[PDB]
Enzyme design. Structure first.
Site, PDB file in Angstrom:
ATOM      1  N   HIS A   9     -14.857 -23.612  -4.450  1.00 40.59           N
ATOM      2  CA  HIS A   9     -14.595 -24.068  -3.470  1.00 40.59           C
ATOM      3  C   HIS A   9     -15.608 -24.442  -3.029  1.00 40.59           C
ATOM      4  O   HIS A   9     -16.776 -23.671  -3.156  1.00 40.59           O
ATOM      5  CB  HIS A   9     -13.489 -23.502  -2.189  1.00 40.59           C
ATOM      6  N   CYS A  63     -19.773 -22.159   3.412  1.00 46.51           N
ATOM      7  CA  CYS A  63     -20.194 -21.016   2.435  1.00 46.51           C
ATOM      8  C   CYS A  63     -21.085 -19.866   1.980  1.00 46.51           C
ATOM      9  O   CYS A  63     -21.923 -21.128   1.343  1.00 46.51           O
ATOM     10  CB  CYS A  63     -18.801 -20.717   1.584  1.00 46.51           C
ATOM     11  N   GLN A  81      -7.216 -16.104   2.896  1.00 44.29           N
ATOM     12  CA  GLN A  81      -5.812 -16.282   4.263  1.00 44.29           C
ATOM     13  C   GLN A  81      -4.741 -16.978   3.521  1.00 44.29           C
ATOM     14  O   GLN A  81      -5.125 -17.924   2.683  1.00 44.29           O
ATOM     15  CB  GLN A  81      -6.867 -17.738   5.408  1.00 44.29           C
ATOM     16  N   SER A 104     -11.453 -20.441   8.444  1.00 51.08           N
ATOM     17  CA  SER A 104     -12.953 -20.828   8.465  1.00 51.08           C
ATOM     18  C   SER A 104     -13.667 -22.080   8.402  1.00 51.08           C
ATOM     19  O   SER A 104     -14.372 -22.586   8.712  1.00 51.08           O
ATOM     20  CB  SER A 104     -13.275 -20.227   7.435  1.00 51.08           C
ATOM     21  N   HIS A 107     -11.420 -27.373   3.238  1.00 51.34           N
ATOM     22  CA  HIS A 107     -12.346 -26.421   2.137  1.00 51.34           C
ATOM     23  C   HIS A 107     -11.617 -27.895   1.304  1.00 51.34           C
ATOM     24  O   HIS A 107     -10.153 -27.905   1.132  1.00 51.34           O
ATOM     25  CB  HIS A 107     -11.467 -25.124   1.765  1.00 51.34           C
TER      26      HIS A 107
HETATM   27  C1  LIG Z   1     -13.554 -19.778   3.363  1.00 51.11           C
HETATM   28  C2  LIG Z   1     -12.811 -18.343   3.074  1.00 51.11           C
HETATM   29  C3  LIG Z   1     -12.277 -17.044   4.265  1.00 51.11           C
HETATM   30  C4  LIG Z   1     -13.299 -17.585   5.399  1.00 51.11           C
HETATM   31  C5  LIG Z   1     -14.021 -18.552   5.093  1.00 51.11           C
HETATM   32  C6  LIG Z   1     -15.184 -17.976   6.125  1.00 51.11           C
HETATM   33  C7  LIG Z   1     -15.229 -16.917   7.274  1.00 51.11           C
HETATM   34  C8  LIG Z   1     -16.443 -18.049   5.330  1.00 51.11           C
HETATM   35  C9  LIG Z   1     -17.551 -17.568   5.836  1.00 51.11           C
HETATM   36  C10 LIG Z   1     -19.078 -18.150   6.262  1.00 51.11           C
HETATM   37  C11 LIG Z   1     -20.127 -17.778   6.443  1.00 51.11           C
HETATM   38  C12 LIG Z   1     -21.120 -18.320   5.728  1.00 51.11           C
HETATM   39  C13 LIG Z   1     -19.932 -16.902   7.380  1.00 51.11           C
HETATM   40  C14 LIG Z   1     -20.733 -16.885   9.218  1.00 51.11           C
HETATM   41  O1  LIG Z   1     -21.967 -17.068   8.163  1.00 51.11           O
HETATM   42  O2  LIG Z   1     -20.177 -15.909   9.392  1.00 51.11           O
HETATM   43  C15 LIG Z   1     -10.817 -16.175   3.297  1.00 51.11           C
HETATM   44  C16 LIG Z   1     -12.022 -15.175   2.355  1.00 51.11           C
HETATM   45  C17 LIG Z   1     -10.670 -14.942   4.580  1.00 51.11           C
HETATM   46  C18 LIG Z   1     -10.481 -16.983   2.640  1.00 51.11           C
HETATM   47  C19 LIG Z   1     -10.670 -18.444   1.790  1.00 51.11           C
HETATM   48  C20 LIG Z   1     -11.797 -17.765   1.791  1.00 51.11           C
END
Ligand SMILES: CC1=C(/C=C/C(C)=C/C=C/C(C)=C/C(=O)O)C(C)(C)CCC1
Length: 113
Positions: A9, A63, A81, A104, A107
Site C-alpha cells: 500500500h 507508513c 482495519q 490511519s 490508502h
Molecule cells: C495502515 C494500516 C493500519 C494502520 C495504519 C497506521 C496507523 C500506520 C502507522 C504508520 C505510522 C508511521 C504511525 C506512526 O508513526 O505513528 C492497520 C494495519 C491497522 C489497518 C490497515 C493498514
C-alpha cells in the site's frame, strides 16, 4: 477466498489521522482534502504509466512499510482495519484499489498474492 492475501500500500496521512506523524514527516499538516488530492494524483500517474506504484510508495508513503516498497506481507481477516481488509480481499492479484479510507489516513492498495 484465500485464507490470507499479500498486499502493498501507499498511505497518505492527514492532520486528522489517528497518528498524524510518520517516518518521513514529524508532524503531518496536510488536510484531508489535500491527502485525497495526492492519492488521486498518484492513481492517475500509475494508470498513465508516468509513475511506478512501488517507487511512489517508497518515496511518499506515510507508513513505515515504505522501506519495503509498500509491502505489508500476508494477512487474514480480523487483523487490519475493516475498510482496508474489505478492499484488499476484493482485489484480484495484480489489481490496485481506488482510494481507501481508514483511521490511519487514505490508502492505495495493490494485491500481490
Ligand atoms: C495502515 C494500516 C493500519 C494502520 C495504519 C497506521 C496507523 C500506520 C502507522 C504508520 C505510522 C508511521 C504511525 C506512526 O508513526 O505513528 C492497520 C494495519 C491497522 C489497518 C490497515 C493498514
Amino acid at each position: 477466498e484465500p485464507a490470507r492475501v499479500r498486499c502493498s500500500h501507499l498511505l497518505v496521512k492527514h492532520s486528522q489521522s489517528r497518528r498524524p506523524s510518520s517516518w518521513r514527516q514529524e508532524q503531518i499538516t496536510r488536510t484531508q482534502e489535500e491527502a485525497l488530492e495526492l492519492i488521486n494524483g498518484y492513481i492517475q500517474k500509475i494508470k498513465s504509466g508516468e509513475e511506478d506504484f512501488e517507487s511512489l510508495a517508497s518515496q511518499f508513503s506515510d507508513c513505515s512499510s515504505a522501506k519495503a516498497r509498500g509491502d505489508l506481507g500476508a494477512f487474514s481477516r480480523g487483523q487490519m482495519q475493516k475498510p482496508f481488509e474489505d478492499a484488499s480481499f476484493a482485489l484480484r492479484t495484480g489489481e490496485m484499489s481506488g482510494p481507501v479510507f481508514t483511521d490511519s489516513g487514505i490508502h492505495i492498495i495493490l494485491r500481490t498474492e
